[PDB]
Design a binder for these strands. Structure first.
Ligand SMILES: [Mg+2]
Ligand SMILES: [Mg+2]
Ligand SMILES: [Mg+2]
Ligand SMILES: [Mg+2]
Ligand SMILES: [Mg+2]
Ligand SMILES: [Mg+2]
Ligand SMILES: [Mg+2]
Ligand SMILES: [Mg+2]
Ligand SMILES: [Mg+2]
Ligand SMILES: [Mg+2]
Ligand SMILES: [Mg+2]
Ligand SMILES: [Mg+2]
Ligand SMILES: [Mg+2]
Ligand SMILES: [Mg+2]
Ligand SMILES: [Mg+2]
Ligand SMILES: [Mg+2]
Ligand SMILES: [Mg+2]
Ligand SMILES: [Mg+2]
Ligand SMILES: [Mg+2]
Ligand SMILES: [Mg+2]
Length: 181
RNA sequence: GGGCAGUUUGACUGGGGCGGUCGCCUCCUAAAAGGUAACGGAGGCGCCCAAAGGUCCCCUCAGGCGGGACGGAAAUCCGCCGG
């Protein structure tokens, strides 16, 4: 379904807007999203995959994609780790799914967040990319209360083509990133 | 069943006994081929695997810095450097 609200926002408003502050000589120099990634540090449930099939299908609902497990590399008995028996979930959503996802998060997820106040602006890692954590996961649409057996939040990475994050700072605000400023 | 009989009771060893050692692999001694001794300096083997094998196909580390709900020097995710 190559169409949606935010998908347009970037073109018929946000694309030229960027050219206003930086004036790119070329049509591609103008930064774009192209990679949204999500990861859950469930080393907590690394014991039994029992409490894991759930957070997977839960994650799948809110993202549309079928998540992919991530094994342990090292081994640390300091907290029950060895080989690859452990666990973590990772899902790389791009294309349309990325937009239909970012619409929910910026227009539904964030606002219903317990005592929200604005995304931390410092979370820009030199190059144009943003990261942020969420203690809960029920702050998503298609998640009912009686469904969650345990509150397990996570964090999402978003990747732009922006070289410097100075530019990136702008591209996010223009899409709908409520920065704490 | 030492009353009695026939015997055995290793070698190396700055004398012998005591101690230590005895076969195999790696490194140094070894003097830029090979080989090379000392009771010279240092360490391992007496197994393991039906996947830890065959072939076809695909992927590339450790580490460092920055950013990230548990995490917290170190779990998993993203970015940059890294032969
Ligand atoms: Mg007898
Ligand atoms: Mg007798
Ligand atoms: Mg003498
Ligand atoms: Mg002697
Ligand atoms: Mg004597
Ligand atoms: Mg002796
Ligand atoms: Mg030994
Ligand atoms: Mg092997
Ligand atoms: Mg490759
Ligand atoms: Mg260090
Ligand atoms: Mg760091
Ligand atoms: Mg950090
Ligand atoms: Mg870090
Ligand atoms: Mg953190
Ligand atoms: Mg927790
Ligand atoms: Mg500590
Ligand atoms: Mg850290
Ligand atoms: Mg990385
Ligand atoms: Mg970077
Ligand atoms: Mg090399």
């Amino acid at each position: 379904p190559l169409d949606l609200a935010l998908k347009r926002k970037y073109y018929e408003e946000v694309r030229p807007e960027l050219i206003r502050r930086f004036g790119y000589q070329n049509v591609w120099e103008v930064p774009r999203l192209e990679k949204v990634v999500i990861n859950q540090g469930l080393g907590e449930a690394k014991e039994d995959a029992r409490i894991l099939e759930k957070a997977a299908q839960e994650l799948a609902l809110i993202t549309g994609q079928k998540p992919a497990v991530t094994r342990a590399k090292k081994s640390i008995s300091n907290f029950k780790l060895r080989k690859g028996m452990p666990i973590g979930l990772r899902v790389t959503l791009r294309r349309d799914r990325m937009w239909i996802f970012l619409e929910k998060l910026l227009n539904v997820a964030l606002p219903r967040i317990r005592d929200f106040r604005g995304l931390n602006p410092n979370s820009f890692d030199g190059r144009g990319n943003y990261n942020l954590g969420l203690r809960e996961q029920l702050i998503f649409p298609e998640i009912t209360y009686d469904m969650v057996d345990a509150l397990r939040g996570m964090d999402i990475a978003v990747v732009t083509t922006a070289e410097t994050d100075e530019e990136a700072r702008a591209l996010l605000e223009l899409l709908g990133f409520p920065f704490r400023k």
